[PDB]
Design an enzyme around this catalytic site. Sequence first.
Site, PDB file in Angstrom:
ATOM      1  N   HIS A 100      -6.958   6.519   2.128  1.00 49.18           N
ATOM      2  CA  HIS A 100      -6.268   6.650   1.060  1.00 49.18           C
ATOM      3  C   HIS A 100      -6.593   5.302   0.973  1.00 49.18           C
ATOM      4  O   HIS A 100      -6.009   4.312  -0.576  1.00 49.18           O
ATOM      5  CB  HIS A 100      -4.766   7.192   0.257  1.00 49.18           C
TER       6      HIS A 100
HETATM    7  S1  FES Z   1      -2.569   5.736   3.186  1.00 45.48           S
HETATM    8 FE1  FES Z   1      -2.635   6.413   5.730  1.00 45.48          FE
HETATM    9  S2  FES Z   1      -2.778   4.365   6.151  1.00 45.48           S
HETATM   10 FE2  FES Z   1      -1.918   4.384   4.184  1.00 45.48          FE
END
Ligand code: FES
Lengths: 48, 241, 71, 64, 51, 147, 49, 62, 378, 54
Positions: F112
């Site tokens: 993300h």
């Molecule tokens: S969204 Fe997976 S490491 Fe932060």
Amino acid sequence: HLVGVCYTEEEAKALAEEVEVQDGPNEDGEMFMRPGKLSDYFPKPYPN
Amino acid sequence: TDLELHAPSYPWSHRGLLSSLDHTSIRRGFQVYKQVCSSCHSMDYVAYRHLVGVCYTEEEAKALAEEVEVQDGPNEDGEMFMRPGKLSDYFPKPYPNPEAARAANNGALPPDLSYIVRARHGGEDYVFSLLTGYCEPPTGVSLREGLYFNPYFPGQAIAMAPPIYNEVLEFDDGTPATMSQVAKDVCTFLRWASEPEHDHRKRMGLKMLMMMGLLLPLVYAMKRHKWSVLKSRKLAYRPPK
Amino acid sequence: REFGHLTRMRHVITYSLSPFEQRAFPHYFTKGIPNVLRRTRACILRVAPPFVVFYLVYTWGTQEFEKSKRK
Amino acid sequence: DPLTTVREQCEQIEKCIKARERLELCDQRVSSRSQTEEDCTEELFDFLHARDHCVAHKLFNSLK
Amino acid sequence: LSRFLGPRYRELARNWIPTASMWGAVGAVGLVWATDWRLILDWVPYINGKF
Amino acid sequence: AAKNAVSQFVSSMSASADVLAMSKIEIKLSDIPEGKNMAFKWRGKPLFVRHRTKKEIDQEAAVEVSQLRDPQHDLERVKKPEWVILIGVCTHLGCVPIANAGDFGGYYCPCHGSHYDASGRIRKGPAPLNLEVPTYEFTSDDLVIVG
Amino acid sequence: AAKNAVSQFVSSMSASADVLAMSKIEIKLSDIPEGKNMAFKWRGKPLFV
Amino acid sequence: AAPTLTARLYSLLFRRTSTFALTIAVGALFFERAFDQGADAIYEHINQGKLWKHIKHKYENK
Amino acid sequence: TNIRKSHPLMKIINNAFIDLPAPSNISSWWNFGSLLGICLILQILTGLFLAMHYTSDTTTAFSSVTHICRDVNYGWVIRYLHANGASMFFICLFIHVGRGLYYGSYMFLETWNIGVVLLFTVMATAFMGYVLPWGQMSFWGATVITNLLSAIPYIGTDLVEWIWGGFSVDKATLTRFFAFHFILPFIITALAAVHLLFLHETGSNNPTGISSDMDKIPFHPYYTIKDILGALFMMLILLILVLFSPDLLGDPDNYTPANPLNTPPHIKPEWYFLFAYAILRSIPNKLGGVLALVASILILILMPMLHTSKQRSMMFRPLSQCLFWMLVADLITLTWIGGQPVEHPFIIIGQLASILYFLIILVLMPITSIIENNLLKW
Amino acid sequence: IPFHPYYTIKDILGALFMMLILLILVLFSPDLLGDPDNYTPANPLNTPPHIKPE
Ligand code: FES
Ligand code: HEC
Ligand code: HEM
Ligand code: HEM
Ligand SMILES: Cc1cccc(-n2nnn(C)c2=O)c1COc1ccn(-c2ccc(Cl)cc2)n1
Ligand SMILES: Cc1cccc(-n2nnn(C)c2=O)c1COc1ccn(-c2ccc(Cl)cc2)n1
Ligand SMILES: Cc1cccc(-n2nnn(C)c2=O)c1COc1ccn(-c2ccc(Cl)cc2)n1
């Protein structure tokens, strides 16, 4: 298996280093030698 | 910021409910794996003895293992013997025992290809749209020195140089090896790779559909026989006046 | 709970016919579809409108996620 | 080359005349100023998606 | 409701409570010898737990 | 029937081990060239051992505490600043990336668009904590004991 | 249909693909220089030369 | 009268509470190469020239 | 001198399955309880074949599974039976619970309470088995669960240290996930025989809710033949999915081997855990998620106490069944949200529908049963 | 007489006397009943002196 039975851990890390064994393959070369790392079964007297 | 591109669905010759894989298209598809890739990629789940009865004859595939010599284990009179390949031979690795194949590949490990079709959202439909949809980077889009602009990659920057072009090799049956012919062949070989039971299951799913057309009407008529006693009965209530 | 111990009943008569005195399908599609059309008009005013409320949220919920990634 | 004869005419659909017609209407705007981060990836995605479907319906009969 | 409250059940709860507590403190201190709760073997230091 | 039937039979599948000397007493080699760090075998995920070699200095203390989510700095956890080891877990998911990818010198989490640092702190969300601690007591000359 | 669970059951535990490809035949000719004999630690039951 | 005037096979077959459970064993035959028709006839008709025994004659004789 | 009535073994079979008084108007929804016993024996036989070839080791486990699918005889048909014969168990289980909720069958209190115990032990067994193939969905689903299990304030942090084997993920890590996964299906079996010892005290309910001791028929031949017809219709639809689309329900990302050095694009459980995953991510705390998880299955025990209607079944209650299908159309919404990215629209819908699941059972149902009593003049 | 308490306590006394004699053999002579030749690995190239079951 000897630490706590016959020798202290030193006297046994240093007893594995008396012989150098053949460990597995690698990059930057092949068939590299290595002394005993205490996860070492007692050396074989014959290849086969 | 940028988004995802989804692969268009192609009319494959095995996308039917009772259909098969074209076995001459898997024959031409192993050659394109042999000579275009297998120098950057691997296949440690497929042996040579798995194509006998599928692509090549057992005589035809015995002499095809001979071409490469694989190191085997220790013995007497030597330490690492060299011998030609048998049929008990998984396809040999391109960078063996590769701590960092990235040294040969600009900081990126190329995957195993044994399950590359079963492990992608779009199946062999995604692999065909990858190899035949290359571009050059568009406006405002930067690039690293070993990265190319592929629209069907999620980061749109892949560390694989385009492996197929017009006539990278020539087939042993005279088909014109254009860019699409070599691609289609390794999406019919790479489906048999990840799913070798594909043809055996579409015929075994015919030997039970004709057995439920017999058995199912014949327990339903045992059912309507017993329940007709209850289905036809009449009731009356006659109390004293 | 065995059969001659369940309840107490008086003044009721039952008439039944053998399975071998009856044809297999008396009224199949002359009576079948006006009977199923009766049971469909009853329980589709209780079952269906909850599921069109899921539909209007699904069609709106993927028309906001696709404008969340563009201009 | 069964691609580039199928590929060529498949961008002569009146749906791909809409998807690429605005690609160089935005291509001329990025390199005007020297400091801007607007990419041109999106009007390429509208063009490739609109081209690669029509290629898929017409290509597999020319081959094998 | 009105099935449940009165001068009867809560004076049956009067001699209940010692029972409840020694049904509760049975569950409290009895859980810690079966599942090796090392955070409560510290509180009474006389019992050598693991060697 | 309780103190000898149930109180015995956890230790086959507990923190009591299988091999005597595994990683806790195993002293570690210089199989790590400084510049990148690649995977290990036990303690679960790769506990990425670090030889900054006079690097990572200043990078640590340039950004201060204000917008930083977690007060946890490498002034006290590791004792002298050419030394750290990492964890292969995350605080929400269990994420470590392919090593040495980023802009500042950190981690390229492509799940993300999150971004992590080399010695284990977070710029982004939705990470509630920062990356947790390994257990160690460094005593001797060169022998690495983590455990 | 009643054999379809159990006629696939007896031929199930005779082994499949790693076995009849090589334990069928193993060609081991032109092994030995003359005058002394070897042992073949294969064939299931052993086999000599 | 007009309906089927043939033989009745319920004074011998199925009627037995035993046969209800014996036609896993005594009724377990007669229909395997009667259904090597259909199964091995419509599979090898839609799959015309694609299987291995349809193409092996090219690389059979040298 | 009827041997069906005097033999010591044969009496028990005759009382339970042959001469049992059964209501005459039992419909098709009473067939899914014997289909659950069909799906359970199938998963036990298929699972014992797969246990002879599996190796619990985080280096050699993804390769043990490919060995049965490519080397062992019939291994491709037995493996894909097992992965698809658990989706069939869970579709029969949710129809079975919705039957007993609709026709008021929870009034058999000792039968209904053992059922809620069976719903926990099934949902926990299908979790321990999905971690065992050890791919990119098997690793990143187990570390999402154990984070929510080290948030229990007094036992939570030493409990996850025991299930992982004392380490993070090594050879003795998957030895405890495999041992609890072998054992719990033989406890689901014993809890299902006690389940039917308590139904034998009253016999069955019927779509009308009214008692039916005047109109009983024997169980054989009327429901021994009607259940057999339903069990063969189940094996048709099951073998359609094993032989025509065996990868329709799973996920491709579990064909990438387990490696923390890379990261998958999404975290997605199977289709039958997606409603329970949209409720964890709806509460932004590791304590109010593990409590809102267990409250979604434990709320079934309050259903006997929340019933305020004069009638037992919902056949004659038309406003109470209008709210039964709002509850079904809300577990569908929680299954679509549970496999979406945590973005802007998929969290306002994920929490306004995790509220409505509890507002219907606890509040809106007992008030509408009272309005119905008042319009029937009690 | 009823089974409880008369034979529920008399069977428990016999079950603890069995676990005494069983754990004597596990902890004082666990190789008293077996055979040493089953500590040589299986190899048809050699032959044992005797064939002996349990
Ligand atoms: S969204 Fe997976 S490491 Fe932060
Ligand atoms: C000389 C290098 C090279 C050759 C030749 C090559 N590859 Fe690769 N391949 C790579 C590298 C490097 C990656 C990893 C790219 C990355 O991760 O950025 C890769 C990755 C892939 C992937 C995964 C892409 C994805 O989205 O994960 C597929 C599919 C693939 N290759 C197919 C092929 C096919 C098909 C051929 C030939 C017919 C081929 N490769 C030949 C270097 C090569
Ligand atoms: C392994 C799981 C289960 C098995 C094998 C099982 C088995 C059965 C069987 C065979 C019946 C009789 C046939 C029928 O009425 O359909 C039955 C009835 C019943 N079951 Fe289940 N069941 C299971 C789980 C559950 C669950 C999860 C619940 C509820 C929370 C439940 C509640 C009931 C009720 C209330 C009845 C009686 C319904 C009536 O007669 O109207 N069971 N069960
Ligand atoms: C009773 C209900 C059961 C359910 C719901 C269930 C569920 C599952 C699931 C979902 C998987 C993952 C399969 C995959 O993703 O490939 C699995 C795997 C597995 N299960 Fe089961 N199981 C059940 C019973 C059993 C039993 C009784 C056994 C053993 C006797 C068993 C042994 C195994 C084994 C060995 C695997 C190995 C991994 C694999 O083959 O994929 N299961 N189980
Ligand atoms: C034991 C018991 C107790 C109380 C009620 C009921 N029951 N369940 N439904 N109805 C109407 C009831 O009377 C039962 C029967 O349980 C079931 C359900 C299926 N079978 C079954 C089907 C076919 C064959 Cl061959 C063998 C068994 N037995
Ligand atoms: C997060 C994630 C990602 C990938 C796979 C999986 N998973 N693990 N097993 N299976 C079949 C999967 O799909 C998961 C777990 O998803 C959930 C959600 C709630 N539960 C749960 C509920 C009750 C109980 Cl008792 C145990 C677990 N599990
Ligand atoms: C010959 C020999 C040598 C060494 C070990 C063993 N053996 N095998 N198992 N055990 C414990 C051993 O001691 C044997 C088998 O000895 C016998 C004799 C008769 N049975 C027998 C009887 C009934 C049935 Cl149903 C099955 C077997 N077995």
